[PDB]
Amino acid sequence: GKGAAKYGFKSGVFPTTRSILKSPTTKQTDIINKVKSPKPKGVLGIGYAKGVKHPKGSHRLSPKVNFIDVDNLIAKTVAEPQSIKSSNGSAQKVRLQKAELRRKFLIEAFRKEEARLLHKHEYLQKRTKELEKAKELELEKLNKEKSSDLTIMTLDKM
Amino acid sequence: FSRRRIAYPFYPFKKLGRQHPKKHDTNLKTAMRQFLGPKNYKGEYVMNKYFTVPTNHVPNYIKPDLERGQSLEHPVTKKPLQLRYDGTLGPPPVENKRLQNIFKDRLLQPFPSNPHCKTNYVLSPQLKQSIFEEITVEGLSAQQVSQKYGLKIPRVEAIVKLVSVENSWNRRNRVSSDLKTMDETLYRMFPVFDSDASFKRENLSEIPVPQKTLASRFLTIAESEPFGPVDAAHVLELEPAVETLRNLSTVGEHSSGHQQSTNKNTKVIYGELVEGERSQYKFTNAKVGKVGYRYGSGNRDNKKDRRIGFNKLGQMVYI
Amino acid sequence: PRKANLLKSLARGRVRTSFNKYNLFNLYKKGGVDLKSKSLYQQKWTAKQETRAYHGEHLTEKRWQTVFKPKLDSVAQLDASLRGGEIKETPFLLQTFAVLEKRLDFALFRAMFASSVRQARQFILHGNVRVNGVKIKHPSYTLKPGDMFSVKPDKVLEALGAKKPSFQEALKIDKTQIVLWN
Amino acid sequence: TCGLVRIRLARFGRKNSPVYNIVVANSRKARDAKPIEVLGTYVPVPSPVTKRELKRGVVPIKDVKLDFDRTKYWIGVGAQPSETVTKLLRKAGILNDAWATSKNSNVNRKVVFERMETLE
Amino acid sequence: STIPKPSDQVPDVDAFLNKIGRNCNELKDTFENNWNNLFQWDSKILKEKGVNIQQRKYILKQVHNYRNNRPIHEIKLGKKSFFGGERKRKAFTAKWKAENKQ
Amino acid sequence: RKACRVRLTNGNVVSAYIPGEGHDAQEHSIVYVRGGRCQDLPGVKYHVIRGAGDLSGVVNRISSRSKYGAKKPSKS
RNA sequence: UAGGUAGUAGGUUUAUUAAGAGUUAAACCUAGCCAACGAUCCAUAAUCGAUAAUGAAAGUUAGAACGAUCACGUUGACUCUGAAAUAUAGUCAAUAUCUAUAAGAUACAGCAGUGAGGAAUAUUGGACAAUGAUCGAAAGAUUGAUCCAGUUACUUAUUAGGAUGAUAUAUAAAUAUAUAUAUAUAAAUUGAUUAAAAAUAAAAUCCAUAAAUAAUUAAAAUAAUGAUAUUAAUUACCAUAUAUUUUUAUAUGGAUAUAUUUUAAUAGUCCUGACUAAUAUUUGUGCCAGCAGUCGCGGUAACACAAAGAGGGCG
Ligand SMILES: [Mg+2]
Ligand SMILES: [Mg+2]
Ligand SMILES: [Mg+2]
Ligand SMILES: [Mg+2]
Ligand SMILES: [Mg+2]
Ligand SMILES: [Mg+2]
Ligand SMILES: [Mg+2]
Ligand SMILES: [Mg+2]
Ligand SMILES: [Mg+2]
Ligand SMILES: [Mg+2]
Ligand SMILES: [Mg+2]
Ligand SMILES: [Mg+2]
Ligand SMILES: [Mg+2]
Ligand SMILES: [Mg+2]
Ligand SMILES: [Mg+2]
Ligand SMILES: [Mg+2]
Ligand SMILES: [Mg+2]
Ligand SMILES: [Mg+2]
Ligand SMILES: [Mg+2]
Ligand SMILES: [Mg+2]
Ligand SMILES: [Mg+2]
Ligand SMILES: [Mg+2]
Ligand SMILES: [Mg+2]
Ligand SMILES: [Mg+2]
Ligand SMILES: [Mg+2]
Ligand SMILES: [Mg+2]
Ligand SMILES: [Mg+2]
Ligand SMILES: [Mg+2]
Ligand SMILES: [Mg+2]
Ligand SMILES: [Mg+2]
């Protein structure tokens, strides 16, 4: 009970939620540019510098983030029935209907997940802009010179 | 240093003396008899002033100190009586000037030892009917009615609901003569609420005291900075008390400015049913990570704080 | 629920939540709790005795200790200086037993639908009460603001009414009345 | 049902008073063990109804909390629901009649009123 | 509610009872040869008539099958093995080999 | 004071004290030993539970019966 | 427990598994690493939480119950199969029992039970009706998983009655409303003769009740199948009904020379010198018998030892 406060006074544990999209999508050019941004090579350096030999049998540069495309993922995973068939049989009818429904749900899920991530990044940026404006506004509001300050002694030339 | 002590009356009373062996009486019992007076064949104590009930809208509460253990008076002429050596009642030799004039606060105070407790005022049926008509027929807002009569918004809405029940009982003649007699008796037993009387009027500016405010905080500013309620509220990260009270005024169920549209954001799917079915599933949208019975949740069933609830039928259940 | 054992005793002199004649005399002859010449523990014990004898005498102290809430409640008046005059001190500590008045039995007692909390509990158990139109048989039911509760008129009449004498007793009183009239 | 990923119910509550939890769990795991995901709750006991409101025409209701989007995703990626979960999901509308069986054929039975969505 | 008509395979209650199987013959007296009773009695009435738990459940299941035109017959109850269940088969087979086949 | 030298089942030998008015403990008697020391006796560190094992409860004990293994007299 | 480590510390090779490194196997070179902020050794021990206890809190404790993570299924090693076993499989050894005396069978830490060790810990129940698993195309079959019930106050939570109540008998007829009803004669348990009580406590009266009864034929589950099972309320007759969250009023139907039938809750256990709530007083014993967590009681004289009467907690 003592530790439930850190998590909201709620007892027990849920399973960790897992991501619909396991890797960053290609349309997130923001994070693509972030990863391709120049890599620090100094006091806070992230990798090897010029003139230093990385250990034999090791890759000097870190691997490449596998950016995925939603359209490519859908194409590889779920494919339309390119060959149409005469579904006269009962089992054929049932299984075709099931496949249709499953494909629709999966494609909808992937599309909505990508949309959600994009909206999330945009909303985060908008919130950051609002907070920066609020910071500047509050700082200048406190910086405004109020007459009541004259009743505080000041050794300015001192 | 403590000891057991029988709760003898603080006021003087005739104690026991030489009692015939087969009487086995106690000073407590003799004090009881002196307080109650003689018991008539009807099983009544007409002598005791508190035996009956008032009919002049003046509460009749005990005044031990004021009366100094003299609860016996004449039933009809309402004159004081006191026990005599010979054992029969008689008016006191000297009048008690404490009882001749009592303050209104002590008149309403029920228990001598507690000055804070005070009886509440009974609303007249005329006032109840007027408030009913003004809230339903005239459409006047609950805030307006509360401001008009001095009553609190919960009380006025409560009386609206109660008078609705009373009207239904009247339509169906459920009220009876015995209930009417109780009505009259307990109406005459309590004082009436007078809206014209300011000291009678309730206060309409009471707000709950929050935890953040309960704590004491002290701020050091130069001897010329103005500092007001808005600044204090900002420092405490709270909204002004005026905003808090204005919200309270509008919170009323039937009061103005009520809004509870939040739930309108969620999705509900009432499933279909066919002939012969006994129930209907009502699915509702949920959010992963915030739904479902949790794993490893504390089992309080064997502890002193196990939760208990009541279902719609009123049945006791373990929640 | 504690069995009713020596509730109306004159010697012990504890004021109960009832309209009984003996309780009335106890309340009459008690001149307040005597805290003179007592240590802190003794003062606390006497206060506990009296306050528990009145409030919730029918709750095992083990249960009352759980029901007890250390947080008291108060309401602040915003027009205190505006009205003018002298300002009185808020009796916070009188809310110590305020957690018990949200129960159904105490609600009936305060509403004067029963002569005592015990009779209110019996009424609830026997099933002569309803809360918001639901027959509630559990005295420990806790109400919420805006709730409505009703009691049967016959039971309320019995609680706030005189006793019905037996036939022979009534005949005795009527014989006496005959003698007086003649 | 077949497959190593299944959508089923795990019991909770007390003796003589159950409440199930719709979850995605490996077929290999225990019934009440921690699943991959918890989709919703389900109270088999219908909401009680008073005699007057029966003659009014009110029907008992069974609460089934559920997250439609993630149920869609899990039934799209190949999870096989257990028969009871299938009845719940189909009756809601997440699944269709393609999951029905000859043993349960209610299409021919008269319908009182169809499903409907509401923004409560 | 609905009472299906008899057929040539099952002209009457005795035919149904014999055909369902699982030693249901002794229920002759309980059902008294009343087709309407057979298709109108539920587990409550069967319990007060004294049939066993398995017997009543089986009878109701086959009654539902017939009412829905599904096949009526006696289905396998399920035996362990000649050499015994898995948890004892190794020992029993060793003993059997030694004592009969040497 | 009446005391006894007793060997527990665990193997350790200790000295216990027999409370009450009179006792029937003898050589090679099966008894139950609990904690608690007789203050006025140096060395003793345990008590024997009256009413358990072969040690009978105190005779004609009507006050604090449970502490001495005495059964309530019905008298009814 | 003051020096430990020789694949030990690096570098090197080539085998080896999908993949790494002294990780195995080789070579192969350097001397190197860990150490008084505690190495190496030796004991003890299954870890943890959004779990339980405690505290104002930092913390301390537990690791039974609800869930995660390890390691085992008599003990030790090794091998198939596999994507993953040193598998509760095989193979050969250790014990300890059986019957087929044989490349024998079995190790209950799965359920229920039996001995034994303990202060101490249940039923050799019922059903696959529900949720899951395994086989099957299905029909269905198997589940000591699981769901129920049985023992056990081990722990919680509910009810386990409540108004009134200090006594009985006897007094002039020889309806427009009385009312402080008085005299009397008796009776009166245990203490006690007054602030010394037990005690409104008993009986008594008035109302209630889950009390054999009397229909639900609810819900757990529906296409069906209910172990639990003698499962919840309103009535002393049921229900459509004029009453829409509202004992419900209409002598509606068979039986009646207005009710004849209700039945009903009975606490134990500690303590009263102070810490520590308990003043109403007595009897016995007389450094003995005996109390006691601490200070301490008991020498005829005990507020402490055994009582009796009162009394204080918890229930
Ligand atoms: Mg004291
Ligand atoms: Mg299959
Ligand atoms: Mg059950
Ligand atoms: Mg000592
Ligand atoms: Mg005892
Ligand atoms: Mg090594
Ligand atoms: Mg290598
Ligand atoms: Mg080597
Ligand atoms: Mg060390
Ligand atoms: Mg160990
Ligand atoms: Mg720990
Ligand atoms: Mg555990
Ligand atoms: Mg530990
Ligand atoms: Mg266990
Ligand atoms: Mg192993
Ligand atoms: Mg073993
Ligand atoms: Mg092993
Ligand atoms: Mg093996
Ligand atoms: Mg076992
Ligand atoms: Mg033993
Ligand atoms: Mg135990
Ligand atoms: Mg079985
Ligand atoms: Mg309890
Ligand atoms: Mg006497
Ligand atoms: Mg059924
Ligand atoms: Mg003692
Ligand atoms: Mg000393
Ligand atoms: Mg003592
Ligand atoms: Mg004593
Ligand atoms: Mg006594």
Short mmCIF file of C-alpha atoms in Angstrom, two decimals, chain B residues 1-11 28-29 31-32 35-36 41-42 45 48 50 62-64 67-71 111-114 116 157-158 161-162 165 169 178-179 182 186 190 203 205-209 211 241-242 244-245 304 310 312-316, chain C residues 10-13 15 21-22 24-25 27-33 36-39 42 54 62-63 65-66 71-72 74-80 83 88-89 91 94 112 134-138 140-142 145-148 151-153 156-157 160 172-173 176-177 180:
data_model
loop_
_atom_site.label_atom_id
_atom_site.label_comp_id
_atom_site.label_asym_id
_atom_site.label_seq_id
_atom_site.Cartn_x
_atom_site.Cartn_y
_atom_site.Cartn_z
CA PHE B 1 -6.19 10.78 41.52
CA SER B 2 -9.55 9.32 40.50
CA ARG B 3 -12.20 7.20 42.18
CA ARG B 4 -15.61 5.84 41.30
CA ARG B 5 -18.36 8.25 42.34
CA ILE B 6 -22.09 7.67 41.95
CA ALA B 7 -23.62 10.45 39.86
CA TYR B 8 -25.52 12.15 42.64
CA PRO B 9 -27.34 15.36 41.70
CA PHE B 10 -25.28 18.49 42.17
CA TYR B 11 -28.34 20.38 43.42
CA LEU B 28 -30.83 7.96 43.41
CA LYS B 29 -34.37 6.57 43.46
CA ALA B 31 -34.10 11.91 43.80
CA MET B 32 -35.95 10.37 40.85
CA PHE B 35 -37.93 15.09 40.32
CA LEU B 36 -40.87 13.27 38.75
CA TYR B 41 -53.39 6.50 38.51
CA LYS B 42 -53.18 7.34 34.80
CA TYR B 45 -46.52 12.95 36.19
CA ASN B 48 -43.09 17.84 36.16
CA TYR B 50 -41.19 18.70 31.09
CA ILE B 62 -34.22 21.60 30.74
CA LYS B 63 -32.68 24.42 32.79
CA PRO B 64 -31.05 22.60 35.71
CA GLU B 67 -34.07 26.02 38.16
CA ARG B 68 -31.76 24.45 40.73
CA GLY B 69 -33.51 21.08 40.74
CA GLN B 70 -37.10 22.31 40.80
CA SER B 71 -38.95 20.58 37.96
CA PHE B 111 -28.36 20.79 26.57
CA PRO B 112 -27.02 22.97 29.41
CA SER B 113 -23.40 21.85 29.09
CA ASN B 114 -23.21 22.49 25.34
CA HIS B 116 -22.94 25.35 20.58
CA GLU B 157 -34.45 22.03 -3.39
CA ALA B 158 -35.05 19.53 -0.58
CA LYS B 161 -38.93 17.43 -3.38
CA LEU B 162 -40.63 16.96 -0.02
CA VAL B 165 -44.21 13.95 -2.02
CA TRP B 169 -49.97 11.92 -0.58
CA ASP B 178 -53.02 10.91 13.51
CA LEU B 179 -50.40 12.26 11.11
CA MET B 182 -48.37 14.98 14.88
CA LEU B 186 -44.42 19.29 16.25
CA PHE B 190 -40.59 24.62 17.28
CA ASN B 203 -25.77 32.45 5.84
CA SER B 205 -21.52 32.60 1.94
CA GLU B 206 -20.26 29.37 3.54
CA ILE B 207 -17.68 27.45 1.49
CA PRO B 208 -15.67 24.31 2.35
CA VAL B 209 -12.20 24.89 3.78
CA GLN B 211 -6.42 21.48 2.72
CA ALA B 241 -13.02 32.31 -2.95
CA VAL B 242 -15.53 34.42 -4.87
CA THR B 244 -15.46 29.10 -5.50
CA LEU B 245 -18.73 30.42 -4.07
CA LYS B 304 -10.48 -4.72 9.22
CA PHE B 310 -25.15 -1.98 -1.53
CA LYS B 312 -29.58 -1.18 -6.54
CA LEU B 313 -31.96 -3.54 -4.73
CA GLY B 314 -30.40 -2.47 -1.42
CA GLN B 315 -28.68 -5.82 -0.92
CA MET B 316 -25.42 -5.93 1.02
CA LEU C 10 -28.84 6.02 37.51
CA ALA C 11 -25.66 5.22 39.44
CA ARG C 12 -23.41 5.30 36.39
CA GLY C 13 -25.31 8.28 34.99
CA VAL C 15 -26.72 10.13 28.86
CA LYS C 21 -37.53 8.90 31.48
CA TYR C 22 -34.47 7.52 33.25
CA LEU C 24 -33.97 12.27 31.05
CA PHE C 25 -33.21 12.21 34.77
CA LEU C 27 -29.27 14.24 31.70
CA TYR C 28 -30.95 16.43 34.32
CA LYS C 29 -28.77 15.53 37.29
CA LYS C 30 -25.48 15.43 35.40
CA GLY C 31 -23.69 18.74 35.84
CA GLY C 32 -21.03 18.25 33.19
CA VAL C 33 -17.95 16.06 33.09
CA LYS C 36 -10.69 18.39 38.03
CA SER C 37 -7.82 16.61 39.77
CA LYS C 38 -7.37 14.05 36.99
CA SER C 39 -4.31 13.19 34.96
CA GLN C 42 -7.96 9.84 33.34
CA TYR C 54 -24.02 8.93 24.06
CA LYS C 62 -12.82 -2.16 17.45
CA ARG C 63 -15.26 -1.11 14.73
CA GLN C 65 -11.76 2.86 15.81
CA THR C 66 -11.88 1.99 12.11
CA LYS C 71 -9.97 14.70 9.57
CA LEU C 72 -12.56 17.16 10.84
CA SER C 74 -15.51 23.05 8.71
CA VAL C 75 -17.05 25.79 6.58
CA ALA C 76 -15.71 29.34 6.28
CA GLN C 77 -17.90 32.44 6.10
CA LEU C 78 -16.62 34.96 3.57
CA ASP C 79 -18.62 37.95 4.91
CA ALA C 80 -17.26 37.81 8.47
CA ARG C 83 -21.25 41.91 8.52
CA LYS C 88 -16.90 33.58 17.47
CA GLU C 89 -14.51 30.64 17.50
CA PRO C 91 -15.89 24.46 17.59
CA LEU C 94 -17.24 18.87 18.22
CA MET C 112 -37.34 11.89 15.18
CA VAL C 134 -35.50 0.97 -1.92
CA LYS C 135 -36.31 -1.18 1.10
CA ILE C 136 -33.07 -1.02 3.13
CA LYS C 137 -32.67 -3.58 5.92
CA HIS C 138 -29.09 -2.64 6.90
CA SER C 140 -25.06 0.59 8.73
CA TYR C 141 -26.21 2.00 5.38
CA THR C 142 -24.45 5.32 4.77
CA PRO C 145 -26.25 14.39 0.19
CA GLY C 146 -29.61 14.71 -1.51
CA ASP C 147 -30.81 11.26 -0.46
CA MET C 148 -34.36 10.67 0.77
CA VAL C 151 -40.48 5.46 7.60
CA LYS C 152 -43.86 3.82 8.01
CA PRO C 153 -46.42 6.12 9.67
CA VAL C 156 -43.35 6.66 13.62
CA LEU C 157 -46.61 6.93 15.57
CA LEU C 160 -43.59 9.33 19.10
CA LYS C 172 -58.86 0.01 36.15
CA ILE C 173 -58.26 3.58 34.96
CA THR C 176 -61.21 5.35 38.71
CA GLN C 177 -62.56 7.85 36.18
CA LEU C 180 -64.13 10.73 40.04
#
